[PDB]
Amino acid sequence: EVKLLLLGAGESGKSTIVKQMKIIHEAGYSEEECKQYKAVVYSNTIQSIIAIIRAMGRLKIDFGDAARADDARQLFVLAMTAELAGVIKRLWKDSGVQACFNRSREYQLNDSAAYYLNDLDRIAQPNYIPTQQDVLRTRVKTTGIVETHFTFKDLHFKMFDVGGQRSERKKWIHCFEGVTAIIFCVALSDYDLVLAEDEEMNRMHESMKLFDSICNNKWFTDTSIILFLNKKDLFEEKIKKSPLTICYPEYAGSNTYEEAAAYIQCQFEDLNKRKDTKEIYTHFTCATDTKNVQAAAAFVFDAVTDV
Numbered sequence: 001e002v003k004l005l006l007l008g009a010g011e012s013g014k015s016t017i018v019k020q021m022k023i024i025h026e027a028g029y030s031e032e033e034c035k036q037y038k039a040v041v042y043s044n045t046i047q048s049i050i051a052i053i054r055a056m057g058r059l060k061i062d063f064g065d066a067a068r069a070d071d072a073r074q075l076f077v078l079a080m081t082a083e084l085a086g087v088i089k090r091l092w093k094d095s096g097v098q099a100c101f102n103r104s105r106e107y108q109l110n111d112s113a114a115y116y117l118n119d120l121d122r123i124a125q126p127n128y129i130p131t132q133q134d135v136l137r138t139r140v141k142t143t144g145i146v147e148t149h150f151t152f153k154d155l156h157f158k159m160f161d162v163g164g165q166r167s168e169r170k171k172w173i174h175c176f177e178g179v180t181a182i183i184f185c186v187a188l189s190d191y192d193l194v195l196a197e198d199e200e201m202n203r204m205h206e207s208m209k210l211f212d213s214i215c216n217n218k219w220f221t222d223t224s225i226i227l228f229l230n231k232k233d234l235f236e237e238k239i240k241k242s243p244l245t246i247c248y249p250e251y252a253g254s255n256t257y258e259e260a261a262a263y264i265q266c267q268f269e270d271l272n273k274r275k276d277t278k279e280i281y282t283h284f285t286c287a288t289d290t291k292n293v294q295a296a297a298a299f300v301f302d303a304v305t306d307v
């Protein structure tokens, strides 16, 4: 009876939200289901550390220890085993690798790269099983449309998740029929990144063009628009290191979590052309934090209840 549509750019966090609805209302991920994602965890860790040493060549950075070159060679051939763990750990500890990691803005690196790598000892053990946090931290591109059903207070939702990348936005239109509410996810940490499809397009700017399209859409003039400003935990960490001016030349405020976030929210709310007729319900979220998403869900519920 209630249709929920998750929209947003790629890496936005929409699929992580779906995962959280199963954790909260469907009592988590079974031990067996976690073992399913074990390969995904390993693939993500491997792809991340590969992405870093590959960046070094492009970025003119070399190891703090020249002996690592044999480990970097070993990483590619092996692409889990206890030898591969020792190789990755040494590469992650290297001063050169760490320098390149702190320049990840200049290439494409998974959000959860450091999360997995900093916990490699746990990840490398035998009989290791992905934790619920580990599963949420996994990245897998969403291809096609995925639906999910859950019931709350005698109201049950149809949640639709779709791919955010340009390759999949053609299929967004197929879902627009009968949408109660839209949850538009935006990565706060995307302000200094660039799209993986287009090397020179700013990720946040892309997210903006999308939100303008959706927020001021002809089909959705009825539907309530919810704006999820996601990845606030990464934004908090990141805003100290990188200035928000990279995304906005005009921004003269401080590079602080509270003030910078407030600014991004305002720029997205300003895209509403029917600003008097239509309201936008905005919430700051950490999609990997189940407790935080529980609070978000309640906020989503209140917006739908307002009907």
Ligand SMILES: Nc1nc2c(ncn2[C@@H]2O[C@H](COP(=O)(O)OP(=O)(O)OP(O)(O)=S)[C@@H](O)[C@H]2O)c(=O)[nH]1
Pocket (backbone or CB within 6 Å): 008, 009, 010, 011, 012, 013, 014, 015, 016, 017, 111, 112, 136, 137, 138, 139, 140, 141, 142, 143, 162, 163, 164, 165, 230, 231, 232, 233, 234, 285, 286, 287, 288
């Ligand atoms: N730290 C942190 N990581 C997040 C957050 N939201 C998503 N991520 C991470 O970012 C990655 C992308 O999230 P995901 O849910 O897959 O985005 P998406 O919109 O579904 O990506 P796509 O299918 O359109 S391509 C995931 O691997 C997840 O672990 C967040 O709020 N905080």
Ligand SMILES: [Mg+2]
Pocket (backbone or CB within 6 Å): 014, 015, 016, 140, 141, 142, 161, 162, 163, 164
């Ligand atoms: Mg997805």
